[PDB]
């Protein structure tokens, strides 16, 4: 199961110049395209090896469309400021998210386009790709515009067409890096807090993709009430890592096991502290 997404963010800075526009593209963690308005020469610059093999016409049209997105989102910042009757000295943020999800077979199962204003959902495209969902009375106006122009047809055409086709193309040009499955290297650590209590920590390092399941079990029974579980953080080299700790009494620490499930595993793993 894969996907391809494009994000954007427009942040206004009054008295500090024109609002900043940034745009990025990912395949399912992997940034391969970046645009920054504060760069020296704003262009759609590559961020992955399997995309640099595209010709200059690709980057030329990408930069053209991205510049159009920047100016359009700046006019959107001014427009939404008019909807909400806001001051001209306040900084505001406008975020955008488009993408398409490909199932196990390779055909579209989900596609979406979403807009947020100041960290709050503003305008969403429903799953039927033919209707909109507005969050407030000011978003109803943008909804009526999208219904008047019937842009859901062009949006559905991109999500069902270009998005899926170029997702396949990106997956084939980057098969060695994107369709890989690195299993996590696992080990369990021990940390006393004081006498009669200890902390068992189950580690999973250097795996891909990001999704993983770490579970602690007391005598083969899940313990998901008293477990610390950090959110999956990136290592910095394209891999991910995660740990899960539980507090156990001193002596009963052999009754605890770490059941770790990952895609790259040939089968689920079960760990126990070794000292």
């Amino acid at each position: 199961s894969h996907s391809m997404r494009y994000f954007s963010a427009a942040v206004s800075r009054p008295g500090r110049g024109e609002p900043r526009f940034i745009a990025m593209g990912y395949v399912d963690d992997t940034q391969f395209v970046r645009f920054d308005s504060d760069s020296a020469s704003p262009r759609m610059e590559p961020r992955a090896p399997w995309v640099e093999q595209e010709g200059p016409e690709y980057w030329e049209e990408e930069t053209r469309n991205t510049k159009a997105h920047a100016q359009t989102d700046r006019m959107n910042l001014q427009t939404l400021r008019g909807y909400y009757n806001q001051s001209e000295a306040s900084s505001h943020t406008l975020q955008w998210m488009i993408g398409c999800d490909l199932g196990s077979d390779g055909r579209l199962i989900r596609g979406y386009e979403r807009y947020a204003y100041d960290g709050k959902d503003y305008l969403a495209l429903n799953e039927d790709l033919r209707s909109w969902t507005a969050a407030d009375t000011a978003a109803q106006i943008s909804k009526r515009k999208c219904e008047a122009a019937n842009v859901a047809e062009q949006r559905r055409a991109y999500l069902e067409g270009t998005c899926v086709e170029w997702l396949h193309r990106y997956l084939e040009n980057g098969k060695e890096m994107l369709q890989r499955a690195d299993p996590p290297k696992t080990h369990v650590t021990h940390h006393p807090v004081f006498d009669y209590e200890a902390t068992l920590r189950c580690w999973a390092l250097g795996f891909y993709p990001a999704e993983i399941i770490l579970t602690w079990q007391r005598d083969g029974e899940d313990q998901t009430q008293d477990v610390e579980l950090v959110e999956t953080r990136p290592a910095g080299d394209g891999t991910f890592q995660k740990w899960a700790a539980v507090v156990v009494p001193s002596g009963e620490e052999q009754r605890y096991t770490c059941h770790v499930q990952h895609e790259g595993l040939p089968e689920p793993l079960m760990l126990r502290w070794k000292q």
Partner: peptide
Amino acid sequence: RIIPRHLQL
């Protein structure tokens, strides 16, 4: 490949 047109809110 990014979508050509942005929405006008």
